[PDB]
Design a protein around this ligand. Structure first.
Ligand SMILES: O=C(/C=N/O)NCCN1CCCN(CCNC(=O)/C=N/O)CC1
Lengths: 540, 540
């Protein structure tokens, strides 16, 4: 028995577990309950705090994963299954995990809080790529990762009603942040230096915590990796969320014909159906065929989000706030396999122009025919208008810039020009053990394994260059967690990471080579998405 | 007595003059009348052939310049005075010139036929830069230059009428080509090899002779130097041409206060007016403040133009035809000091962002406010959106591409893809004796000096490098006139000139350096003008 694996929080006593890294052990506490199980009558309702328990709750393994869709388009394939659930599915899933160094820090240490992505329909903090044992050992910080309700269980919204207000998944993350602010000190963590970081939908969640007033006091810094709250996929209107919720109820037999009708009878009927039944009809409520679009997503109700994310970003004071932000080299290449015509992960995807003209409608859904002609213009090399190799990566840029790159660059510039300290990066390293085809380059979400120091795992087949490269990135992220500056506090030998300003627009390239400063997060392409096309949609 | 300076044509006998070049003499016949003077009741009417005369007509000096506006914006400035008339103005101006080598060729020699430009409102074959003594002596070819009516006297059109049909200025050029087919052999020229070549509005006129059936039988090859018939300035609609004709009549006092205003009474009142009075109200007819727009231009009417130039270029067959087209490096830079705000030839024209936003409305007149923002989007550096030096060259590209570069690139692509053998060039040499400011680079029309061998004149301060450079260009144009191929027939040593096709789109940079093959005649920019902007103006 180690005296450090026994820790008492405000709810009760816990028993952690020691993990083994090549450089030392780490005390981990996996599966702490931070909310009452949202089952039965609590489905679609905001979370309630965990009632205090008697005894010692076992915290030596990851708890259950929230109910979600499971990708089966490529069985056995590691590229898709690495994000699939690794524990059993249950609505009793609201748990968090805390990693702390050994020996436990005597002084308060900055805290990192990870929010997994997964398009607000999937994800779990128990994934092997989110194993934070390598970060808290190499940088001696504290890491906390929580589970939140995805799918309809976390984002089915009947706005205005009480039985289904929506954004209950975002409230799950907020309750975990309140838990960290009240209990991370018992693990040696500094609640006055909490840094949020997330990827994809988790990055969009970090951005919505910047814009929600009740959540701002629960952290101090933010990191958004390949995601932003102002994306075309990260929010839906009240009128659309009500239509998607009513269609899901109809697909499962709610209301029973013929009874109706109001929101009270509709949600009460939804609570009687099994959880997996609701999941089996999640994708059948999307309005049209598309990629990078998800069914149940954070809504602009008016409570958690007083206005649309775009408006709050433009009318907010961001002084005294440090933000890290970046994207990968090929954001859209991952999503083309899931809908774009003529795309297969097992060939070269040398598409024809007819397939390219059709793919723009899938990549850019719900838009006028004239607006499609404008997208075809900007992303077509007119010296070689039918080269399959160029058309392939052109549509990859379309989906990447429309959903991730330009919504992120829009957010990064407005933050710096309004008082926030902003740093920008572009991840340009493809892992040697990547199972996706070559033409995808660096897919969506394949920098997470380097942030958490996965190449340090001796059971993996990474190169010696990638191990040193992962330690640089871990120190980049940890330095931002401590001082809000990724540059070394004193070390001048390493190249400098200049802040991203609204005018200069400077970012760095994260790869095996040293830092390289560049200007423009696809400024020419993103001016089409952020400036002209909105004016093209008002005059239909 | 040199018996080579007295030649008999179908009209009568002529008397030429010997002019000396550093390489030898050349016989010239300047001022041959090819039509009865269009005065009095002949104003605005098509030309009629010159009746035969008695005795010897003196052809020693250039005749009179057609009535036209004279530029007085910069008095004494050679950059503008070089295009102003050098002979006195008169309505009796329909005269042509022929240059023939000495000794006169005993074998029929291919003929080059020059059509001067100047926005269909000015110009004269008597300009010093149109001297064909060097082009004829160095390559032993027959040069023929003509005068055609400009301004209202050549292009005022009341469509459907009989006294103001329009395109009578283009009919003057046709009559001169008929004169060449009947009399160029008397000077030693081959009427079965005539090659039209013009610049600006003259280059457009060369294109309109390609699209006119009654004129296609009068030549075999074509050269369009920075000008195309499908440009937004080369033609005008029926209804607008009538409004511009009625606008001019009102400003001069037609009809008198109290009388009717049909087409017959309007022109009869116009014929009773002094020629200079009509010229003094030409620019007060344009519908708005603009540049690269002219009052009286050729009119699509169903006679000389059975349809619009763009329609005839698309539905035309051009087998058995070889064309040579091209542009200068800085087309629109010259027109910016004629209306664009913040421009001045005496400073560096470092304009502001607001001046650039207003210049697009002047450079691109009569477009929806939404259409201009698409132009602003495509022609601004979004990383340096406020740099005056970049905004200056940007607006130069806007006027250059919209009026010249893109209308020409579309024509060359349609000609090659439908039978014609097209050759494309880009002139990139700034003359060492140029008087315009340096930021204009290579302005509109400053390659004519080198084609006509002007640097060979000993009374000028051209460098020795430009003298060899001019001889290269005179041979390119002469080889095209002889065989239809600008490359040397007996030479694989010198760099070759690949034809321009609709697929590869290869062109050549003409400079002191050897030939350099490039691809794409501003493809990315011209795809916005030729393809997208029509689709946007349709949905307005
Ligand atoms: O990868 C991440 C997060 N990484 O952290 N984002 C989700 C990527 N999605 C890509 C496209 C949508 N969708 C495909 C699966 N379902 C279907 O579209 C049709 N199924 O039948 C989900 C996967």
């Amino acid at each position: 028995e180690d005296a450090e694996l026994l820790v008492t929080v405000r709810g009760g006593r816990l028993r952690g577990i020691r993990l083994k890294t090549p450089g030392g052990p780490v005390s981990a506490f996996l599966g702490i309950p931070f909310a009452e199980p949202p089952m039965g009558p609590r489905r679609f309702l905001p979370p309630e705090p965990k009632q205090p328990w008697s005894g010692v709750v076992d915290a030596t393994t990851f708890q259950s994963v929230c109910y979600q869709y499971v990708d089966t388009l490529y069985p056995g394939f590691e590229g898709t299954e690495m994000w699939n659930p690794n524990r059993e599915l249950s609505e009793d899933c609201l748990y968090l995990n805390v990693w702390t160094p050994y020996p436990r820090p005597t002084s308060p240490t900055p805290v990192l809080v990870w929010i997994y992505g997964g398009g607000f329909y999937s994800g779990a903090s128990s994934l092997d790529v989110y194993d934070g044992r390598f970060l808290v050992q190499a940088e001696r910080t504290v890491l906390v990762s929580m589970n939140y309700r995805v799918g309809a269980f976390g984002f089915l919204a009947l706005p205005g009603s009480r039985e289904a207000p929506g954004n209950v998944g975002l409230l799950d993350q907020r309750l975990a942040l309140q838990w960290v602010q009240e209990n991370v000190a018992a693990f040696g963590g500094d609640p006055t230096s909490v840094t949020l970081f997330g990827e994809s939908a988790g990055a969009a969640s970090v951005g919505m915590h910047l814009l929600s007033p009740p959540s701002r006091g629960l952290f101090h810094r933010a990191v958004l990796q390949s995601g932003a709250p102002n994306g075309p996929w990260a929010t839906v209107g009240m009128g659309e969320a009500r239509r998607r919720a009513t269609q899901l109820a109809h697909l499962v037999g709610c209301p029973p014909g013929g009874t109706g009708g109001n929101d009270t009878e509709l949600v009460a009927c939804l609570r009687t159906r099994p959880a997996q039944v609701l999941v089996n009809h999640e994708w059948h409520v999307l309005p049209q065929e598309s990629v990078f679009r998800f069914s149940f997503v954070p809504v602009v109700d008016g409570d958690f989000l007083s206005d649309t994310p775009e408006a709050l970003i433009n009318a907010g004071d961001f002084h005294g706030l440090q933000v890290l932000v970046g994207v990968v080299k090929d954001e859209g290449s991952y999503f083309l396999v899931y809908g774009a015509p003529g795309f297969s992960k097992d060939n070269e995807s040398l598409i024809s122009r007819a397939e390219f003209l059709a793919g723009v409608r899938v990549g850019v859904p719900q838009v006028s025919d004239l607006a499609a002609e404008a997208v075809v213009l900007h992303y077509t090399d007119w010296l070689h208008p039918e080269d399959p190799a160029r058309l392939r990566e052109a549509l990859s840029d379309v989906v990447g810039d429309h959903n991730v790159v330009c919504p992120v660059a829009q957010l990064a510039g407005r933050l710096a020009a309004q008082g926030a300290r902003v740093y920008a990066y572009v991840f340009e390293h493809r892992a040697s053990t990547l199972s996706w085809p070559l033409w995808m380059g660096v897919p969506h979400g394949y920098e997470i394994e380097f942030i958490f120091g996965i190449p340090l795992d001796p059971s993996r087949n990474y190169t010696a260059e990638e191990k040193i490269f992962a330690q640089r990135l871990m120190r980049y992220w940890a330095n931002f967690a401590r001082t809000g500056d990724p540059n070394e506090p004193r070390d001048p030998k390493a190249p400098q990471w200049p802040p991203y300003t609204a005018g200069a627009q400077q970012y760095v390239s994260l790869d095996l080579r040293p830092l390289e400063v560049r200007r423009g997060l696809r400024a020419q392409a993103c001016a089409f998405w952020n400036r002209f096309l909105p004016k093209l949609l008002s005059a239909t």
